Amino acid sequence: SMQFSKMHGLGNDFMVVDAVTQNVFFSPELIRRLADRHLGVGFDQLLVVEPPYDPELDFHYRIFNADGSEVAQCGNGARCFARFVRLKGLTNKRDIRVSTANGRMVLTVTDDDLVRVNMGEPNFEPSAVPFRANKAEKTYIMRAAEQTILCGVVSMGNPHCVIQVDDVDTAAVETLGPVLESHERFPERANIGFMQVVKREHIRLRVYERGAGETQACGSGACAAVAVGIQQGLLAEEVRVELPGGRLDIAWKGPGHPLYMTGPAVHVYDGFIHL
Amino acid sequence: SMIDDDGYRPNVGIVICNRQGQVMWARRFGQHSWQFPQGGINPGESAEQAMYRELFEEVGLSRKDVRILASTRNWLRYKLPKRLVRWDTKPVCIGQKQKWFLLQLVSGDAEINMQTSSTPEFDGWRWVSYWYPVRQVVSFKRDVYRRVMKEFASVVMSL
Ligand SMILES: [Cl-]
Ligand SMILES: [Cl-]
Ligand SMILES: [Cl-]
Ligand SMILES: [Cl-]
Ligand SMILES: [Cl-]
Ligand SMILES: [Mg+2]
Ligand SMILES: [Mg+2]
Ligand SMILES: [Mg+2]
């Protein structure tokens, strides 16, 4: 009987499997079956922990979707993964080196059991976003339909436009969101963040994601909101970010430094299923 | 002569860890494949004795270079793939019965010497992360390796 866990992270339900001490091959057929809530387990995504491919790394892990396809999105599942390998006694390390479909990471498990990810250094060069503007400004002016908007623009590897909002529950994420997402000055579109500054160290946020609309927990959007807010002199070095799907904690010392994102992972259950 | 009635040779395998929780990975002589040290138990010797004997023979480590942290409670067998069985040598050996030992290397790395015998089984070594051998081991040993490393994991983590 294959052991598994259910875990919850970045607003997502993961089935998580130790494929290090267990011998299991995840064919697309088996994955689709496990994804079946009645024949199998049921999950948003399946996180499979494997032995490393590189002798200087601790593990490899893969993420599969319900269709049985491998998913390669940067940082996906990292918090659940780090907490899982510690909870299951596969490692006792606090800094865990891991390879994924998108490359390698060093994940740090903090003392309050949160998981910190080095997200790289934010890039404000418009050409790198890509953003249509002549030089990097701390604040830009954009006309959205019958409106003018002040915004910041940054790349976390993906493009982001952040807008200050005085109450995220009121803001028209459904109207301004689509207009700025596919705005002409974003040739490759942009994630649109609606940031409410509660305190220099505390924001609320909603994100109209590039192509996906409003999601519950866009990590890169939280990073981008804090990076712009810090660049604009509005935010402290460490900011709590409250998203519809939970809380993150961003840390950044400004240009020349990487930005860190810290988040929880909930161990929801353990289970077994006869394959 | 040591082959049992099923065709399995009694055998000892060795997982050598350092204080960082890495494990020693050895390169098969004149090959590009790697494994943990292991060796046949001789008529006369216990598992422990065979272990120290093969340890010095294969790795050049003496009794005072290491300390035993654990051994497996039971014997773990692996079967050779049919194409590797030498059917004309009686008694025929179809696999190894194994008693695994977890050692901590307590001396410096310079004490590892892969040339104490005239016929070395290995020609190099490196430290690898703890679980890397479960992937990299040759297929027909993976079942044993997975079970050994699972059993040893809690001891190695606790250092
Ligand atoms: Cl996660
Ligand atoms: Cl404009
Ligand atoms: Cl994106
Ligand atoms: Cl000795
Ligand atoms: Cl594997
Ligand atoms: Mg040998
Ligand atoms: Mg030998
Ligand atoms: Mg021998």
Structure tokens at A145: 């339909």
Q: What distance in Å separates the CA atoms of residue A267 and residue A245, rounded to the nearest whole number?
A: 16
Identify the helix (H) or strand (E) that includes residue A47: strand A45-50
* SS3 state at A75: coil
Q: How far is CA A147 from the centre of its chain?
A: 30
Strands of chain B, DSSP E: 8-17, 23-28, 34-35, 38-40, 66-71, 76-79, 95-105, 122-128
Q: Which of B143, B106, B110, B148 is nearest to B130 (CA)?
A: B148
Strands of B6-117, DSSP E: 8-17, 23-28, 34-35, 38-40, 66-71, 76-79, 95-105
B134/chain A closest Cα distance in angstroms: 7
A86 → chain B, closest CA residue: B157
* SS3 state at A265: coil
Which chain B residues have a beta carbon less than 8 Å from that of A20? Answer: 131, 134, 146
Other beta carbons within 10 angstroms of residue A116's beta carbon come to 21
| Contacts with A39 (C-beta within 8 Å, 6 or more apart), sequence order | A33
Q: Are B146 and B140 in contact (CB under 8 A)?
A: no
State the DSSP code for B81.
Answer: P
* SS3 state at B125: strand
Cβ distance B134 to A20 less than 8 Å, yes or no, reads yes
Q: What distance in Å separates the CA atoms of residue A211 and residue A206, rounded to the nearest whole number?
A: 15
Q: What distance in Å separates the CA atoms of residue A150 and residue A173, rounded to the nearest whole number?
A: 15
Q: What distance in Å separates the CA atoms of residue B17 and residue A92, rounded to the nearest whole number?
A: 15
Domain ranges of chain B: 1-159
B159 → chain A, closest CA residue: A92
Q: Are B65 and B102 in contact (CB under 8 A)?
A: no
Q: Are A168 and A194 in contact (CB under 8 A)?
A: yes
Catalytic residue among A74, A80, A151, A161: A74
Other beta carbons within 10 angstroms of residue A148's beta carbon come to 8
Angle at B145 between CA B143 and CA B147, to 5 degrees: 70
Whether residue A218 lies in the annotated active site: yes
A58/chain B closest Cα distance in angstroms: 6
Q: What distance in Å separates the CA atoms of residue A131 and residue A102, rounded to the nearest whole number?
A: 24
Q: What distance in Å separates the CA atoms of residue A226 and residue A223, rounded to the nearest whole number?
A: 5
Which chain B residues have a beta carbon less than 8 Å from that of A57? Answer: 129
Q: Are B133 and B44 in contact (CB under 8 A)?
A: no
Write out the CATH class of domain B1-159: alpha beta
Residue A149 CA to ligand 2 center (angstroms) comes to: 9
Catalytic residue among A80, A151, A161, A218: A218
Q: Are A119 and A258 in contact (CB under 8 A)?
A: yes
User: In this structure, which CATH number among 3.10.310.10, 3.60.130.10, 3.40.720.10, 1.10.10.1200 belongs to the domain A116-140+151-262?
Assistant: 3.10.310.10
Q: What distance in Å separates the CA atoms of residue A180 and residue A172, rounded to the nearest whole number?
A: 12
Q: Are A145 and A179 in contact (CB under 8 A)?
A: yes
Tell me the torsion sign for CA atoms A219, A223, A224, A225: positive
Q: What distance in Å separates the CA atoms of residue A272 and residue A269, rounded to the nearest whole number?
A: 10
Q: Are A131 and A138 in contact (CB under 8 A)?
A: no
Structure tokens at A52: 């490393």
> φ and ψ at A264, to 5 degrees?
-90, 170
End-to-end C-alpha distance for chain A, whole angstroms: 7
State the DSSP code for A69.
Answer: -
B134 → chain A, closest CA residue: A51
A63-98: burial string, b at 16+ Cβ within 10 Å, e else: bbebebeebeebbbbbbbbbbbbbebebbebeebbb
Q: Which of A106, A101, A31 is nearest to A64 (CA)?
A: A31
| Contacts with A247 (C-beta within 8 Å, 6 or more apart), sequence order | A240, A241, A263, A264
Nearest by CB: B153 against A53, A89, A93? A89
Q: Could you tell me where in chain A the CATH 3.10.310.10 domains are found? A: 1-115+263-275, 116-140+151-262
CATH of domain A1-115+263-275: 3.10.310.10
* Resolution, Å (one decimal): 1.8
Q: Within 13 Å and on the Cβ side, how many CA atoms surround B61?
A: 26
Q: Are B12 and B101 in contact (CB under 8 A)?
A: yes
Q: Are A80 and A16 in contact (CB under 8 A)?
A: yes
Whether residue A223 lies in the annotated active site: no
Structure tokens at B140: 């027909």
* SS3 state at A257: coil
Other beta carbons within 10 angstroms of residue A268's beta carbon come to 16
